[PDB]
Ligand binder design. Structure first.
Ligand SMILES: CCCCCCCC/C=C\CCCCCCCC(=O)O[C@@H](COC(=O)CCCCCCCCCCCCCCC)COP(=O)([O-])OCC[N+](C)(C)C
Ligand SMILES: CCCCCCCCCCCCO[C@@H]1O[C@H](CO)[C@@H](O[C@H]2O[C@H](CO)[C@@H](O)[C@H](O)[C@H]2O)[C@H](O)[C@H]1O
Ligand SMILES: CCCCCCCCCCCCO[C@@H]1O[C@H](CO)[C@@H](O[C@H]2O[C@H](CO)[C@@H](O)[C@H](O)[C@H]2O)[C@H](O)[C@H]1O
Ligand SMILES: CCCCCCCCCCCCO[C@@H]1O[C@H](CO)[C@@H](O[C@H]2O[C@H](CO)[C@@H](O)[C@H](O)[C@H]2O)[C@H](O)[C@H]1O
Ligand SMILES: CCCCCCCCCCCCCCCC(=O)O
Ligand SMILES: [Zn+2]
Ligand SMILES: [Zn+2]
Length: 281
């Protein structure tokens, strides 16, 4: 409904409000209060931090999920959608020609009734986005969007620049209140700002770190909480092909584009290199 669609944006409104208020706070008040050359230097650094935050946040929010291609879709009519075991055999015969090595716990082919999709490996259905999403990490209320194959790099860059911004604001307010305490000048209310920054920082520390873990090992959140099932059973490392190539699968080979939110991730969204094949030519 209209109500629901409005309510889905409130986390984004909250983060955007906190960020804009921190901008207004630092730029005028705090930057003025703490040499002209120094002030301009720090104002331009702060502005670069701000622009990278908004850049990465925007592309995290507004990059739609990647979706399985036609080859993975069943083009059935409403009539044909009907006996379950014949469907099982049909899906098996189709999967004979698809690069799908993961199965359900029962061993069945993973299939989405809503999208009519033979799910690729690492693809999962999001009921919020209401679509199958390739290498879906998780649906994020905070970016009002799925985080997966298409935007994961933008998400991690957004966490990083969020952290840098938090450190900038926190350190600035600390210096302001120290200089007040040493009588070299207060705006007591901006103390709250510090308490906010700190909080977010520490939160990001747990989040960033966690994702570091995931990215180091080529593991999605869903996979971390439910290991994928292969022909020989569950395997927590089925897609782990080494730290370097795990990192480059997300950030690409070109160092210049690592820290900017332009799409640079490797592979199609469907087949992902098996750890078990990592030394096969
Ligand atoms: C671009 C980023 C990449 C950079 C390189 C990354 C280097 C490598 C990074 C990390 C490798 C370090 C591995 C630590 C494992 C310790 C042992 C341990 O706890 O075992 C436990 C798992 O362990 C965890 O659950 C870890 C949780 C992560 C918390 C945040 C710390 C991240 C480290 C921050 C690093 C920041 C480095 C600085 C980054 C600039 C137990 O295992 P289990 O029983 O199988 O768990 C089942 C849980 N289940 C129930 C949910 C299924
Ligand atoms: C917790 C801290 C509680 C402090 C209340 O927050 C404080 O509110 C007062 C009340 O105007 C503001 O006070 C401000 O306006 C007053 C006059 O109204 C002026 O002396 C001055 O421009 C400034 O101090 C402070 O800038 C703010 O720090
Ligand atoms: C016992 C039972 C058991 O509250 C606080 O009020 C102050 C003062 O009004 C506002 O203060 C505001 O105005 C002042 C100008 O005067 C500026 O510093 C700034 O624009 C802003 O801080 C704060 O934004 C608000 O957080
Ligand atoms: C403060 C920073 C906290 C950092 C913690 C990062 C991990 C939390 O991340 C979130 O945790 C929940 C715990 O409910 C995970 O787990 C949740 O989803 C999975 C899969 O749908 C379920 O199997 C699980 O039982 C459920 O709890 C989510 O998949 C993950 O998105
Ligand atoms: C007052 C200083 C700045 C405070 C605001 C800084 C920006 C913090 C934004 C953190 C958002 C984290 C979103 C996590 C999403 C997820 O894990 O699904
Ligand atoms: Zn689906
Ligand atoms: Zn979603």
């Amino acid at each position: 409904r209209c109500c629901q669609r409005i309510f889905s944006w409130i986390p984004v409104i909250i983060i955007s409000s906190v960020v804009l208020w921190s901008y207004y706070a630092y730029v005028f008040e705090l930057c003025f209060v703490t040499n002209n050359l120094e002030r301009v230097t720090y104002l331009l650094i702060f502005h670069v931090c701000f622009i990278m935050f908004c850049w990465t946040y925007w592309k995290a929010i507004f990059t739609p999920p990647s979706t399985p291609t036609k080859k993975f879709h069943l083009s059935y009519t409403d009539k044909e959608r009907y006996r379950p075991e014949v469907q099982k055999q049909i899906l098996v015969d189709i999967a004979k020609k698809l690069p799908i090595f993961t199965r359900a716990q029962s061993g069945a082919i993973r299939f989405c009734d809503r999208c009519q999709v033979i799910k690729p490996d690492r693809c999962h259905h999001c009921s919020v986005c209401e679509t199958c999403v390739l290498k879906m990490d998780h649906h994020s209320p905070w970016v009002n969007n799925c985080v997966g194959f298409s935007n994961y790099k933008f998400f991690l860059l957004f966490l990083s620049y969020s952290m840098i911004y938090c450190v900038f604001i926190a350190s600035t307010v600390f210096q302001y209140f120290l200089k007040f305490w040493v009588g070299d000048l207060a705006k007591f209310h901006v103390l709250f700002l510090l308490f906010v920054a700190l909080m977010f920082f520490v939160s990001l520390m747990f989040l960033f770190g966690y994702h570091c873990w995931l990215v180091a090992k080529n593991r999605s959140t869903l996979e971390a909480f439910s290991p994928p099932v292969f022909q020989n059973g569950p395997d927590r490392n089925g897609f782990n092909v080494g730290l370097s190539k795990n990192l480059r699968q997300v950030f690409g080979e070109h160092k210049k584009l690592w820290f900017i939110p332009v799409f640079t991730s490797q592979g199609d969204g469907h087949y992902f290199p098996l750890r078990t094949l990592r030394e096969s030519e």
